Each structure stands twice: as structure tokens, then as C-alpha cells.
Amino acid sequence: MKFAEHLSAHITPEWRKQYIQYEAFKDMLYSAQDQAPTVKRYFAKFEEKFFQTCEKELAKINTFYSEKLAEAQRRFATLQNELQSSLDAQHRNIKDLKLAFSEFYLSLILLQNYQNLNFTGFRKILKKHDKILETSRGADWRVAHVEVAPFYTCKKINQLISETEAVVTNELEDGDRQKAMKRLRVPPLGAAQPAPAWTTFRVGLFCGIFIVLNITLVLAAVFKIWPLIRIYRGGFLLIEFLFLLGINTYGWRQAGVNHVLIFELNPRSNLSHQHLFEIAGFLGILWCLSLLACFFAPISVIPTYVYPLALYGFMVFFLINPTKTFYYKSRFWLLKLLFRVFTAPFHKVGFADFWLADQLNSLSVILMDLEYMICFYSLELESGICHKYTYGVRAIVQCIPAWLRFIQCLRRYRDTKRAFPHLVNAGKYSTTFFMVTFAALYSTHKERGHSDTMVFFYLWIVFYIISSCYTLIWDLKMDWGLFDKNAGENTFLREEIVYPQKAYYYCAIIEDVILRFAWTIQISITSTTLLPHSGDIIATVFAPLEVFRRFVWNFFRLENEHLNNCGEFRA
Amino acid sequence: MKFAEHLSAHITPEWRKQYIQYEAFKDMLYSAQDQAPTVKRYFAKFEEKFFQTCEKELAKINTFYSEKLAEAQRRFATLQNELQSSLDAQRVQHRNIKDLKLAFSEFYLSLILLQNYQNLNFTGFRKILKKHDKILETSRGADWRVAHVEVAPFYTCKKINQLISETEAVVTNELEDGDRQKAMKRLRVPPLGAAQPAPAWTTFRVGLFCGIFIVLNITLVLAAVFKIWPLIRIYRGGFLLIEFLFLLGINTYGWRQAGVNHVLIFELNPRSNLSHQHLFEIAGFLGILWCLSLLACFFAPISVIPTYVYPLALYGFMVFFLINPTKTFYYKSRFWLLKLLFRVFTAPFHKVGFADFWLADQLNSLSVILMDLEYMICFYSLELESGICHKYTYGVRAIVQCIPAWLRFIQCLRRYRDTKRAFPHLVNAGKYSTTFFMVTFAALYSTHKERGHSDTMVFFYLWIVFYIISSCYTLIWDLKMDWGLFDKNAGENTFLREEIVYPQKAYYYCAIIEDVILRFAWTIQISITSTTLLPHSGDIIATVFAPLEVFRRFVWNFFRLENEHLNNCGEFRA
Ligand SMILES: CCCCC/C=C\C/C=C\CCCCCCCC(=O)O[C@H](COC(=O)CCCCCCCCCCCCCCC)COP(=O)([O-])OCC[N+](C)(C)C
Ligand SMILES: CCCCC/C=C\C/C=C\CCCCCCCC(=O)O[C@H](COC(=O)CCCCCCCCCCCCCCC)COP(=O)([O-])OCC[N+](C)(C)C
Ligand SMILES: O=P(O)(O)O[C@@H]1[C@@H](OP(=O)(O)O)[C@H](OP(=O)(O)OP(=O)(O)O)[C@@H](OP(=O)(O)O)[C@H](OP(=O)(O)OP(=O)(O)O)[C@@H]1OP(=O)(O)O
Ligand SMILES: O=P(O)(O)O[C@@H]1[C@@H](OP(=O)(O)O)[C@H](OP(=O)(O)OP(=O)(O)O)[C@@H](OP(=O)(O)O)[C@H](OP(=O)(O)OP(=O)(O)O)[C@@H]1OP(=O)(O)O
Ligand SMILES: O=P(O)(O)O[C@@H]1[C@@H](OP(=O)(O)O)[C@H](OP(=O)(O)OP(=O)(O)O)[C@@H](OP(=O)(O)O)[C@H](OP(=O)(O)OP(=O)(O)O)[C@@H]1OP(=O)(O)O
Ligand SMILES: O=P(O)(O)O[C@@H]1[C@@H](OP(=O)(O)O)[C@H](OP(=O)(O)OP(=O)(O)O)[C@@H](OP(=O)(O)O)[C@H](OP(=O)(O)OP(=O)(O)O)[C@@H]1OP(=O)(O)O
Ligand SMILES: CC(C)CCC[C@@H](C)[C@H]1CC[C@H]2[C@@H]3CC=C4C[C@@H](O)CC[C@]4(C)[C@H]3CC[C@]12C
Ligand SMILES: CC(C)CCC[C@@H](C)[C@H]1CC[C@H]2[C@@H]3CC=C4C[C@@H](O)CC[C@]4(C)[C@H]3CC[C@]12C
């Protein structure tokens, strides 16, 4: 029933063009029916055209199946050779070979699903054509040609699957089929797997509680010793980033962007956007409860400062929970990625490391707020000393994410020796160092008149412009790939675009243009004392805008990486 | 991946014992493999016994399929005869055509159920024989499947497919003017039971409403503990309605999980029926509105708006949400509920089915809403002696209290007239009339308390005796007639019946205890609310007890539906 959406959802995105165009055939049949007036000869011509189109589709399917089968056979031969070499050598290598075998099994199951779905679509479309035309020739065509097509009559895929199972059981799992087929089953994949009902209910409950608590917080703030905005901005930004990341995952899944392969995640087990929404909602509930406790201070004995810490500490615990609960696999993966990023020069830079470093570049406000909290606790607990004065440590903390990205680019240059991309990106990140340093120098010299304060102000202005232009150009031309020379119809874009609307691309371009300058202004204001009066308000307003810009950027960067190997993270 | 769960979720509950015993075969195979130590002789003996059991199961499946096929052929013949008679005959005609269409749809659903039985049994046989082959490392299971299972009548007979095709053709040619799509829109049978989960958006909305309701309840409690109109008497009805809807959603979920076919019992459409998630959604939305109204009453942020507008609107919206003509919000279920309510409130003039009696019982458990409505009518009539609407009792109050009992009593009388079977209907009528007697005696005692008639103590004693009488009558009817417990055929389940659908017997014992306690509590609450009785703490007692009455009516719904599914306790089916 309603095979169109079934086909659309169960199609492998990377092979979309190689599947049968069920919607195209439906449109052809409906148009022929509408244009039907000579009637018999017209119907005969339409039948001939439909059969020719079906023959073309069948030939395309057959050739794709043949090439995929040949590739699978070659990969199986290489894997068998590797396994034989490993046996001749006789732990980590065994695990890597097992992962490779799992990937090969997933590819084989994907090919099997492709052929099964193609046959089902052929049968359904021919049945629909027979029903509409009131003729049985469609069934005859299906039986004569489709039923005997090599792609449908070839069981080599099944034999390869069985051989893979036997090899894995005998050699890798030590003769126990129970160990095999677990991690080697390929459960439902893509959008074809509905999210758990309990997960959706939890997501809804958390969003509802978050909304009501936000309404209560606004009402209290309108009707009602410690900087609350500074302390809680980091948590709010983290929750917003998690929610927008869930939206990013949903869009990637809907748009056919194979983010799983790009991020090097397990195709069989993946974190759905619903899980990200659930985590964001729970964290937002905790954040709102802490803020409400701060505003009201229900328990008099417990001091106010316990409420924020108790939240953030819990968050840290939630991230580092040793127990295998609450998304333990994803949490451990995130911990490993964070450790690799913060020790960037000593590890090979994959796509995930660079992406997370960029996210930290966008979320630097959290680190800056942590430094401000440390200063406030150390000194305040001259009034407002941490806010009226700046120092080198503040600038270094601001630049830490840019330092990580710059060192990652240097490591990539060392590994690949390709000057252009990595060195240009390194310069694009060092613009941040220059701008922050000059802003800090100007702020320091403003108090103690050096007679060169205006020189530093001008240098900061030019470096601000340079950094904004550099970042915007890199985002538009390299991260997003837009403004390409191959745009046949998609002006200012590339030749291939996956998202349905180009208006989204144009709006994203405009928002990136505005928000790159906005974020540069926010960094300049926060890292120094440029605007001691309204600096906090502007920074607080701009940080969510920076997160939104970083969300749109993730969308389009993942879309470019999937379409083109812009990051050069894959062979 | 796990055909045991898939089968259990796809077996038609009515034929639960007529399917291959996949779990029993699994347990047998595991036990045989566990005790394996000579060895080949034991393996051969186990194989012989296992295949004897498989042959017995195949024979049972074939017999059941033959009986169902014969019944289907007879039903199709009768339907064809009725259709031919209707065609030869050509407002009553439209109803006859609609009834014929519904009967054809029901027969097609039965045919699809039989086909699903066939497919599931074949797949289970194949999957269990493959498992036996893998466990015993032999290919004899496949040979047995091919030689016997693959040639059994149940698997080789295609009479069901031909009957389906003939039914489709006849419905399209003589009931839809040749429109095959229109016929198939009603004949098609989507997945039934737990086969198809509810929409993700529905679950998300249910969760959102639940969270908002919880937070708003917390806010209301905080406002009442820290921060002209009786708000308890104005919001108790709404709270009880929301609680009853939530417990009804729980009841639907439990019925679906336990296999109790309430769709057939309630005569609901099997191709499209409301799920428990939709009931939770409605309950959560109504609870959100109720909490918002109560918060507005507590705070009254806008001063120009009078506080009495806040409750009214809420309840008004509820009424509007129940009589909304547009086909927007659960319009099918809303119209069905409106028709059922109209039939119940006009019981003697309509045939009493399961739905009408069940809804009348729900009203009986929800009589507090009518009492609160009458109290508010009094308050707006007189109070707007200051508190004259809670210090004296009048006949109208007792009549409004007994209205649900009157409806059930008249339903029982109509059923007795229709069937002429005196025992059940008349005993139930007396059970409901005990309510009239108790309420009347309580009202008489309350009225005579003020004046020294010297007959107030006799009225008190009459109220006491009839209170115990009503409590015992209702409890005995619930335990022995509604739930079908304390039967004679129960040789294993003590104090229960021979067959129990719910997983745990402890549920039944706790339900019995709670039924006793909350039946006594319900009688006390009705006595207190109908008449003065306690003039100071009666309000709080009634407010506390009404949720308990709803909970008792929810447990009773569970067990009554279970008993109806098992046995024809209500005699609403042939
Ligand atoms: C000062 C630093 C601030 C903290 C650092 C910044 C952000 C942290 C949050 C998210 C970054 C990770 C986003 C990855 C997205 C990839 C696409 C995707 O959505 O794919 C998901 C990514 O899921 C993940 O692994 C992690 C997702 C995030 C879950 C949230 C964890 C708690 C967050 C709060 C941290 C509290 C810190 C306190 C504040 C200082 C695939 O999931 P899987 O189940 O295949 O996981 C991999 C399992 N294998 C490897 C076995 C297949
Ligand atoms: C004393 C004051 C009033 C007391 C309370 C009155 C009524 C509430 C009681 C019961 C509601 C019906 C429960 C269904 C039981 C059968 C099991 C089942 O779940 O069956 C459902 C029936 O769904 C329902 O009926 C609707 C469920 C209830 C929704 C509540 C609506 C809002 C009420 C507003 C409050 C009104 C009072 C105003 C305030 C003063 C299956 O749905 P379907 O789509 O298969 O329906 C059949 C439709 N075909 C036959 C055309 C396919
Ligand atoms: O009787 P109708 O008209 O209500 O349904 C018919 C038709 O719908 P129509 O009105 O033309 O649009 C098919 O397409 P559709 O709408 O679902 O949509 P899509 O174009 O695929 O998106 C439908 O599903 P499908 O064959 O395409 O998957 C199929 O149902 P059903 O018997 O279950 O088919 P089986 O799976 O059991 O073979 C019926 O085909 P016929 O048996 O050959 O008459
Ligand atoms: O399955 P592998 O062989 O590829 O890797 C598994 C291996 O860890 P490694 O990589 O070698 O360091 C196991 O440790 P090990 O060698 O002592 O023993 P084993 O012989 O495997 O039992 C570990 O504990 P365990 O679960 O198996 O008992 C398991 O954790 P995980 O399932 O997350 O956690 P749980 O929630 O299930 O507890 C890993 O599963 P994955 O990471 O999903 O692949
Ligand atoms: O676990 P593995 O990998 O070593 O072997 C599994 C495999 O058996 P296989 O080799 O074909 O005979 C499954 O068949 P499959 O989906 O590929 O499909 P096909 O029928 O071939 O198309 C079978 O599922 P199922 O379809 O019968 O439901 C599953 O049974 P299990 O989960 O118990 O579920 P149930 O018996 O309760 O249903 C077996 O697991 P275990 O029995 O636990 O060890
Ligand atoms: O339930 P029913 O079959 O007894 O009655 C149906 C009948 O109207 P009624 O309610 O009896 O007054 C249909 O038209 P009708 O009078 O010419 O009679 P027939 O039954 O064809 O003889 C009407 O079609 P429409 O114009 O809205 O599309 C449909 O409306 P609605 O519920 O919104 O359902 P939807 O079709 O939108 O899903 C009703 O429900 P259903 O057919 O189940 O759907
Ligand atoms: C601020 C002004 C100038 C522009 C604002 C444009 C915003 C609203 C645009 C920029 C990028 C857009 C997103 C780009 C891609 C997707 C994925 C798609 O599957 C759903 C819509 C979604 C999620 C878009 C929603 C709208 C969006 C977020
Ligand atoms: C505190 C005591 C007196 C109350 C009586 C015990 C309560 C907890 C018992 C009485 C009947 C029981 C229910 C009976 C049937 C079902 C259906 C099943 O699929 C899930 C559990 C569920 C929903 C039970 C939950 C527990 C329950 C509600």
C-alpha cells in the first residue's frame, strides 16, 4: 500500500539514481490517461513507450547490480587474503578485520535490499499499468523479462553472505554462530526504522516541562551577589546546541546526507535525532530548575551558589558516567573525540575531530564564562575587578578553540603536505589570534595611556575586518562549496544540491554573512573590555546567534562533504 | 527476528489456542538439547515425539481452518442471498444498503483474518522446523515440512483467495456502482491489534501534554500552599473527567496487551479505532486546560475579566470539544460517543447493547459531576442564610444523584422485557434500586434531622441497613457477575475462574480487595454528597473519594471487559 513512500524511504540514498523511478512511471501513466482522446493506436504507442522506458530502467538496474556484485566479490577476496595473512601471523588487528567484515556484510545486505526493492517496484508498477490500461500485457512483460533478469535470478549475493557468516563464525568467533549475526545483522536502517515510542514520549514530556519552566522563569524575572546570566549562559548555549544538533541529524537523515559514514559511526547502531532532543530537553529541565532555585532560593540553608554548580557538575558527571547507562556508547565516543581534539597535534585529524573543534570554536563562550567564574570566585569572593580589567589569560582562553583548529590544520599539512587548503585555513584561524591580541592590547592601553591606543584600535579594526572576511569566504567557498563554476541552473551554488529549496541556501548565505560579523564582534567584546557597560548584553544576545549560525554551517558543511570530499577525509 | 513475539502480537485473540504452539516447541527443543548426554537413540526418540506433537498441531490447524472455511462459505451464501433480495426489492432502503455494506466488510475482515491465520501458521511451522534442524544438526525437519506441512489442506487450499476475489467483485458491482477504489477503501483491512504502532507525532503530543500537565499541577499546588466561589465544587468534575479519560486510555492499552478484544465487544470499527495514545492525548489537553483555568482563578491576572468566566469557558470548551460539528478533532469517536450518550439518556426507547450499559455504569461511577453541576445551579440560583445550598437537602438533589442509577435500572428493565430472562436483569435492577432506597432514606433522615418528628432515628437505621444492603449487593454483583470470579470450574486459580487472561493472579486478588474497600467508600461518598449527613467534612471526604471511585471503576472496567471477552456474562452476543 502506497509503495511510493515505501520506495522513497527504503532507497539507499547513495544509489538513489540507480533505483526504479516509480513516481516517474506513475506520472507517465496518469499523463497518458489524462491525454487519452485513434484511441487504440494512441494506447498502443503509449504501451510501446512505457515498455521502452521499462527496458531502459531494467538495463540500468542490471548493470548497476553486476558492477556492485563484482566489487563485492573483489572486496571479499581481499578480506579473505587479509584474514589468511592474520592467521599466518598467529588482537586489535582481529577487531579491525571484524569491523571490516561487518562493513562488507552491511554492503551485501544493502545490495540484497536494493535488488528486492527493485523487483517489488517493477511488479507494483507493472500491476498499476495493467490496472490503468485494462490490459494484461504488463504481467506478460514482467514475467518474460523481469522474472528472468540477472539481478533477480542471481543468488551470488546469498552465497557470498553465507560464506561471510561461515568465515566469521569459524575463524573470528571460534565456531559459534550465536556470536556471529550480532553486530553482523544489519537491522532496519535509515528512516525505515521508527523511533521508540517511549523515546518519543520522553522527548515530548521534556519539551513540555522545558516550555512551562521557561514561561515560569520569564514570569518570575518580570515579577521578582552572583552573576546569574554569566553562570547560566554556558548551560543555555549547550542546551541550544544540543537541540540544534538534533535538528541537524534529522535534516541529514531526511536529506539523504550520509553523515554516519562521514562521522565514522556504526551504521547498525546510531543515535537518532529523537535521542538528541531527549538529552537536550532533560538538560534544559535541569538548567531551568537550577535557575528557578537561584531566583527563589527555596531552601534557605542551602546557599544559592550550590544550585548552578550542582547543575554543571551533574552535567560533567552525566558526560563521564562510567556506568554503561544513559547513552554510554555515545558518551564514550564523545569523550574520546574530545580527548583527541584537546590533544590535537598528537593525533591524526579525521572529519569528526575537525568538526568538533569547529563546534568548540562556535561555543568558546562556555570556556570564557568558566574563566569568568573562576576569576569571580578567586578575586570577588575593587568591585567588579574581573569585569573592568582584562589580562592575557583571558585572551588565551578565548583563543583556545582557534588554537586547536590551527594546530589541527598544521597537523593536516604535515600529514598531507598540501599547502593550499590547510595553510589557508590555518591563516583563517590565526586571524582570530591577531584580532584578540590587538583587542586585548587596546583594552590594556586604554587605562594606562600609552599614546598609541588609537594605533592598536585601528589595527584591531583592520584585523577584525580581515578575520570576518576570511571566515565568511572560507564558509561560503570551501565549507559550503557554493559559488561554484559548474552551476548550470543553481546560480551562486554548486551543480548538485540535495536540500529541496535554493531559497534555504540564499537565506543561509545571508545569515552567515551577518552572523560572522556578529560573532567576531561578540568575541572582541567578550575577550576584552571594549564595551564595559553593555558588553555582557551584546555577548549574551550574540552567543545564541553564533550557535544558530554554527547549526546552519553544520547543515551545509555536511551537505558539501557528502557531495564532495572537500575535507579530504576519505580516499 | 523473534517470531515468538511477532506471532503473539499477530495472533487473533479469539483463536489464541488455535495457532501452532511456537513457545511450547521452543521449550521442548531446549529441554531436549539440555538433557542430551545411546545418544543417537535418545535423539531419535526425541525427534519421533517432537514430530508426533507437530502432526497433532498440524491436524488441529487443518481442522480449525476447515471449520472457519465452512463458516465463511455459509456467511457468503447468506450475504449473497440478502444482496439479491435487496436488489429485487428495488429512507429504509438506504439503511438496508448501509447495513449490507457493513456486513460485507465484516465478512471480508473475517476472510482476511483467516488468511492471516494460514500465513502465520505456515511461517511458524517453517521457522520452528528450521530451528529444530539447526539445533539437532539435521535436515529432517525440512523434509517433514515439505512432505507434510507443504501439502496440508490448510496450506494448499486457495478457496479463501477465491472467496476474497468474489466478495470484492460483488461489492464493487452491486454496492458501489462499479467503483473498485471506493469498495476497497472500506474492504481493506489494515494491521490490527498492536501490529501498527501509533503515529510518532501522537506520542510526542501525548508526552508534551503530560509534561505540561505535571508542571502546571506542581505550580497549582505551590500556589495553593503559598499564595465568593467554591473552586473545589467547580473543578472536581473536570478533574474527575480528566482522570477517567486517562484511566480509560490505560484500560484500552491493557485490553490490547492482554488480547481482550474490546473492539468487537464495543461493536467498534476494526479497520479504524481510537488507540490508548489518543485517549492520553485528549486527557492531557483537557488537563492542561483545567490547570490553566484553575491557575487563572487562583491568580486572576486580568481584573476586568470576572473569575467565574474562567471555569465556565473551560467547561464550555469541553462541551464545544464534544459537539464540534466539523470533522477536525476525533470527529468519528466524538460522534459515536454522542450517539451512545443519547441512547443511554433515552435508555428505555433503545435496545441495550454492551456499549450503552458500560457507558451508563461509567456515568454511575461519575455521578459526582452531575452533583457538582446541580450544586452550581443552586449556587447561581440562590447564593448569588448565606450557604443555603450546602446546609439543606431537597428532592431534586437526590433525584440528580440517582439519575445514573435510574438509567441503569431502566436499562435492566428494558433488557428483561427484551429477553424475558428474569434472573440476571431483575437482580441487577434490584442492585441499582438499592441505590434509590439508600439515597431516599438518607434524604429523609437529613430532612428530619432539623425538626423533631421523632422519626429521624428510624430513618437513620433504615439508611444504615440499606447502605450495607447496597454495598453487599454491588460487591457481589461485581465479583460474581461482572468479573466472573469465585466460579466452580477454577481448580487451579483459587477464588478466580478457570481461565484468566491477565498475566498475574495477584492483580485479581488486589482488585477484589480494592473493589470491596472502594465499594464501601463509594456508598459512603454517595450518601454524604446526596444529603447533608456530615455538614463540615463531607466536602473533603467526597473530593478524596471521587478519584477513588474513578479508580475502582477503572479496575472494574478491566475485569468486566476481560470476563465479557472470555464468557458472555452480559449476554450481548449470540
Ligand atoms: C567545554 C566543552 C563543551 C562540551 C563539548 C561540546 C559539545 C558536546 C555535545 C555534543 C558533541 C557531539 C556531537 C556529535 C554529532 C555527530 C552526529 C550524530 O548525531 O551522531 C551520533 C553522535 O553521538 C555521539 O556519539 C555523541 C552525541 C552527543 C550526546 C550528548 C552527550 C552529553 C552532552 C553534554 C556534555 C556536558 C559537558 C559539560 C559542559 C562543560 C552517533 O551516535 P552513536 O550512538 O553512533 O554514538 C557512537 C557510538 N559508536 C562509536 C559505538 C558507534
Ligand atoms: C456527567 C457528565 C458527563 C460524564 C462523562 C461523559 C462522557 C465521557 C465518558 C466516556 C467517553 C467514551 C470512552 C470510550 C469507551 C469505549 C472504548 C474506546 O476506546 O472506544 C473508542 C470510542 O471513542 C470515544 O468514544 C471517544 C473517547 C472519549 C473522548 C472524550 C471527549 C471529550 C469529553 C468532554 C467532556 C464532556 C462533558 C462537559 C463537561 C461538563 C474507539 O473509538 P473509534 O474511533 O473506534 O469510535 C468508533 C467510531 N466509529 C464507530 C464511527 C468508527
Ligand atoms: O484498490 P486501491 O485503488 O485502493 O489500491 C490499488 C492501488 O492504488 P491507486 O488507487 O491506483 O492509487 C495501489 O497503489 P497505491 O495507491 O497504494 O500507491 P503508490 O502508487 O504505490 O504510491 C495499491 O498499492 P501498491 O500496489 O501500489 O503498493 C494496491 O493495493 P493492494 O491490493 O494492497 O496491493 P498489493 O501490495 O497487495 O499488491 C491496489 O492495486 P491493485 O490490486 O492492482 O488494484
Ligand atoms: O564486541 P567487540 O568484541 O567488538 O567489543 C566489546 C569488548 O570491548 P573492546 O573493544 O575489546 O575493548 C568487550 O570487552 P571484552 O574484550 O572483555 O569481551 P567480550 O568477549 O566482547 O565479551 C566489552 O564488554 P562486553 O559487553 O562484551 O562484556 C563490549 O562492550 P559493550 O558491548 O559496549 O558494553 P555492554 O553494554 O554490552 O556491557 C565491547 O562491545 P562493542 O564496543 O559494542 O563492540
Ligand atoms: O541468532 P542466530 O543469528 O545464530 O540465528 C537466528 C536466525 O536463525 P536461522 O539461522 O535462519 O535458522 C533467525 O532467522 P532469520 O531472521 O535470519 O530469518 P529466516 O527465517 O531464515 O528468513 C531467527 O529468527 P526467526 O525468523 O526464526 O524469528 C533467530 O531466532 P530467534 O531470535 O530466537 O527468534 P524466534 O525463534 O523466537 O522467532 C535465530 O536466533 P537464535 O534462535 O536466538 O539463536
Ligand atoms: O461511516 P459511514 O460509512 O456509515 O457514513 C459515511 C457517509 O456519510 P454519513 O456519516 O453516514 O452521514 C459517507 O457519505 P454518504 O452519506 O454518501 O454514504 P455511504 O456510506 O457511502 O453509503 C461520508 O463520506 P464523505 O463525503 O465525508 O467523504 C463519510 O463521512 P466521514 O465519516 O467524514 O468519512 P470519510 O470518508 O471522510 O473518511 C461517512 O463515514 P465513512 O464512509 O465510514 O467514511
Ligand atoms: C536569519 C535569516 C536571514 C535567514 C534564516 C534562515 C534559516 C531559518 C534557514 C537557514 C538554513 C535552513 C535549514 C536548511 C536545511 C534544512 C533541512 C530540511 O530537511 C528542513 C529545513 C532545514 C532545517 C532549514 C530550515 C530553515 C533554515 C534554518
Ligand atoms: C492499592 C491497591 C488496593 C489498588 C489495587 C491494585 C492495583 C495497583 C491493581 C488492580 C488491577 C491492576 C491492573 C489489572 C490489569 C492490568 C493490565 C496489564 O496489561 C497491565 C497492568 C494492569 C494495568 C494492572 C495494574 C495494577 C492494578 C491497577
- Of A296, A326, A356, the position where a domain reaches its end is A326
A268 is in an annotated binding site: no
Helices and strands in chain A: count of H runs, count of E runs = 20, 0
- The span from the CA of B242 to the CA of B255, in Å, is 20
Is there a domain that residue A260 lies in?
A: no
- Resolution reached, in Å? 2.8
Neighbours of A374 (CB within 10 A): 13
Q: At which residue does the C-alpha cell 467498534 appear?
A: B268
Atom of ligand 3 nearest to the CA of A124: 26
Check whether residue A165 and residue A243 sit in a common domain.
no
A204 to chain B nearest CA, in Å? 4
C-alpha atoms less than 13 angstroms from C-alpha of B511 in its C-beta half-sphere: 22
- Of A143, A158, A190, the position where a domain reaches its end is A190
Is there a domain that residue B274 lies in?
A: yes
For residue B510, the CA-to-ligand 8 centroid distance in Å is 8
CB burial of residue A521 (10 Å; 0-12, 13-18, 19+): middle
Q: Do B216 and A216 touch (CB under 8 A)?
A: no
Cβ atoms of B86 and B174 closer than 8 Å: no
Q: Do B207 and A200 touch (CB under 8 A)?
A: yes
Length of chain A: 571
SS (H, E, C) A539-571: HHHHHHHHHHHHHHHHHHHHHHHHHCCCCCCCC
Describe the crossing of helices B159-174 and B39-89 by its angle, rounded to 10 degrees: 20
Neighbours of B312 (CB within 10 A): 13
Check whether residue B126 and residue B201 sit in a common domain.
no
Length of chain B: 574
Check whether residue A17 and residue A35 sit in a common domain.
yes
- The span from the CA of B401 to the CA of B526, in Å, is 8
Handedness of CA B213, B214, B220, B221 (dihedral sign): positive
The end-to-end CA distance of chain A, in Å, is 41
B210 to chain A nearest CA, in Å? 6
Cβ atoms of A212 and B216 closer than 8 Å: yes
Check whether residue A179 and residue A202 sit in a common domain.
no
Q: What are phi and psi of B421, to 5 degrees?
A: -75, 120
B186 is in an annotated binding site: no
Nearest C-alpha in B relative to A196: B200
Task: Tell which residue, A211, A230, A242, A217, has the closest CA to residue A554.
Answer: A242
Nearest C-alpha in B relative to A181: B1
Cβ atoms of A283 and A239 closer than 8 Å: yes
- The span from the CA of A7 to the CA of A120, in Å, is 9
Q: Cβ neighbours of residue B265 under 8 Å, at least 6 residues apart?
A: B354, B561, B564, B565, B572
Check whether residue A209 and residue A152 sit in a common domain.
no
DSSP state letters, A300-341: SSS-TTHHHHHHHHHHHHHHH--SS-SSHHHHHHHHHHHHHH
Check whether residue B322 and residue B443 sit in a common domain.
no
Nearest C-alpha in B relative to A212: B212
B364 is in an annotated binding site: yes
Distance from CA of residue B14 to its chain's centroid? Answer: 16
DSSP state letters, B19-71: S--HHHHHHHHHHHHHT---HHHHHHHHHHHHHHHHHHHHHHHHHHHHHHHHH
- Residue-range definition of the domain harbouring residue B466: 365-574
Inter-chain contacts counted by CB atoms under 8 A, chains A and B: 62
SS (H, E, C) A240-279: HHHHHHHHHHHHHHHHCCCHHHHHCCCCCCCCCHHHHHHH
Cβ atoms of B145 and B125 closer than 8 Å: yes
B398 to chain A nearest CA, in Å? 42
DSSP state letters, A82-146: HHHHHHHH--HHHHHHHHHHHHHHHHHHHHHHHHHHHHHHHHHHHHHHHHHHT-SHHHHHHHHTG
Question: Between vectors from CA A82 to CA A77 and to CA A88, what angle results, nearest 5°?
Answer: 125
Is there a domain that residue B352 lies in?
A: no
Mutate to test the pocket of ligand 5, among B1, B120, B134, B145 (most ligand atoms within 8 A of CB): B1
DSSP state letters, A287-299: HHHHHHHHHH--S
- The span from the CA of A400 to the CA of A407, in Å, is 10
Is there a domain that residue B356 lies in?
A: no
Q: At which residue does the C-alpha cell 443519547 appear?
A: B342
Indicate the residue type of B142. A
Check whether residue A47 and residue A134 sit in a common domain.
yes
Residues 183-222 of A with CB under 8 A from B: 185, 194-195, 197, 200-209, 211-213, 216
Cβ atoms of A528 and A439 closer than 8 Å: yes
Question: What is the CB < 6 Å shell around ligand 1?
Answer: A 238, 245, 249, 259, 263, 265-266, 269-271, 279, 315-316, 319, 327, 329-331, 333-334, 359, 366-367
Q: Do B200 and A195 touch (CB under 8 A)?
A: yes
Nearest C-alpha in A relative to B196: A194
Task: Kindly state if the Cβ of B184 falls inside 6 Å of ligand 3.
Answer: yes
Per-position b or e across A268-279, b if 16+ CB within 10 A of its CB: bebbbbbbbbbb
For residue A161, the CA-to-ligand 5 centroid distance in Å is 15
CB burial of residue A241 (10 Å; 0-12, 13-18, 19+): buried
Is there a domain that residue A333 lies in?
A: no
- The span from the CA of B333 to the CA of B199, in Å, is 17
- Of B285, B312, B345, the position where a domain reaches its end is B345
- The span from the CA of A90 to the CA of A440, in Å, is 60
Check whether residue A211 and residue A237 sit in a common domain.
yes
Per-position b or e across A53-79, b if 16+ CB within 10 A of its CB: ebeebbebbbebbeebbeebeebbeeb
CB < 8 Å to A201, chain B = 203-204, 206-207, 210
Check whether residue B24 and residue B106 sit in a common domain.
yes
Q: Do A208 and B207 touch (CB under 8 A)?
A: yes
Q: Cβ neighbours of residue A466 under 8 Å, at least 6 residues apart?
A: A431, A434, A435
- The span from the CA of B559 to the CA of B563, in Å, is 6
User: How many distinct structural domains can be found in chain B?
Assistant: 3
A549 is in an annotated binding site: yes
Cβ atoms of A161 and A184 closer than 8 Å: no
Torsion region of B85: left, alpha or beta (phi above 0 gives left; psi -120 to 50 gives alpha): alpha
- The span from the CA of A313 to the CA of A316, in Å, is 5
Cβ atoms of A150 and A66 closer than 8 Å: yes
Nearest CB among B1, B206, B215 relative to A201 is that of B206
Check whether residue B185 and residue B208 sit in a common domain.
no
A428 is in an annotated binding site: yes
Q: Cβ neighbours of residue A453 under 8 Å, at least 6 residues apart?
A: A442, A445, A446
CB burial of residue A483 (10 Å; 0-12, 13-18, 19+): middle
B interface test, pick of A128, A198, A205 with most B CB neighbours within 10 Å: A205
Indicate the residue type of B274. L
- The span from the CA of A403 to the CA of B57, in Å, is 73
Nearest CB among B197, B204, B219 relative to A194 is that of B197
Check whether residue B9 and residue B125 sit in a common domain.
yes
Is there a domain that residue A331 lies in?
A: no
All cell numbers assigned to B46: 526425541
All cell numbers assigned to B570: 452480559
Q: Do A204 and B206 touch (CB under 8 A)?
A: yes
Is there a domain that residue B417 lies in?
A: yes
- The span from the CA of B60 to the CA of A8, in Å, is 43
Mutate to test the pocket of ligand 7, among A245, A504, A548, A553 (most ligand atoms within 8 A of CB): A504
CB burial of residue A387 (10 Å; 0-12, 13-18, 19+): middle
Is there a domain that residue B357 lies in?
A: no
Check whether residue B373 and residue B318 sit in a common domain.
no
